[model samples]
Target: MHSDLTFCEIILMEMESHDAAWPFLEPVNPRLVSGYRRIIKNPMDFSTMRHRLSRGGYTSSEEFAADALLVFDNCQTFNEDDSEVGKAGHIMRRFFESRWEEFY
Candidate 1:
């Protein structure tokens, strides 16, 4: 059987551990932070984009890494002009995206 944790979810777990690098944790929506933690526990749930990769010819870990990395990159891009929370989220996003290959 396939693993219950999606590739993105696995990376998120690693990302959460690096929260020390995030400079504005208090300002960021605590709800957003809690949401990530909660979702990682049940990545099979609909709130994540986990299911989309399998049908897009991204069945392997490497391919899924690319897809997941792109999502983080875009989040950073779109939040570039946001406030402290955005800046901190971008930092966390970069950390995980840069180390995608090492996650699994």
Candidate 2:
């Protein structure tokens, strides 16, 4: 299976390339998002995921998946389900889960 870390990076690249993935590619700035940090105590993004995974921050595959799921959860919490970003979260979440099934 080669390097699991490398595998993770490949997935990140794939997800990052998705059109619906733009909002989750980088960290949401509290300054721009306004109270984003207060509303979302735990922020998740592709860049952060890669950083953590690179630094041994994840001990298990589920942990990495959880971080990804968290991104969508936070988006739903902060953005309206009918809103563009919220809808993107929905699409991206579905896309991620579909790909995740192959990780087994």
Candidate 3:
């Protein structure tokens, strides 16, 4: 989540990755993005989507959720993780850095 944009906005910016199937920007507000986070929190909890990720020795999903909560503890949401908006701010900085590197 960038300072000027939401999680969905960041995803929208990466539209090329999904072959342009992403939704329109107008109807996607903060609530919708939070919904995305909610489902993502327990992906395998559902029948449609069931997956997880991990890095190093950390299983970066449910168990890692604890860490995620700590990291994103302050965000507003429809998302289950209930992360903080400031967490999004940190990600915004990272995304800008990643984009800047790509430019060079």
Best by TM-score: 2
Q: Write the per-residue lDDT of candidate 2 for residues 8-82, one digit (tens) a residue.
A: 676777888999888988999899987797899888898899789778887777778889899999999999999
- Rank all candidate structures by their TM-score, best first, as comma-separated numbers: 2, 1, 3
Better of 1 and 3 by lDDT: 1
The ten-residue window of minimal lDDT in model 2 covers 1-10
Estimated TM-score for each candidate? 0.41, 0.86, 0.23
lDDT values of the candidates?
0.47, 0.85, 0.32
Write one digit per residue (lDDT tens) for candidate 1, span 9-95.
666455545653444222234365545544332222111333454354445566555544554444454444376645656676667
* Predicted structure 2, TM vs. truth: 0.86
Q: What is the lDDT of candidate 1?
A: 0.47
lDDT of 3 at 66: 37
| lDDT of each residue in 1-104, candidate 3, tens digit only | 12322332333245313321122212234464545554334222110111122113333223433323332222322323324434443453354346434433
Per-residue error at 80 for model 2, in Å?
0.4
Model 3 quality (TM-score): 0.23
Indicate the residue-level lDDT of 32 in model 3: 46
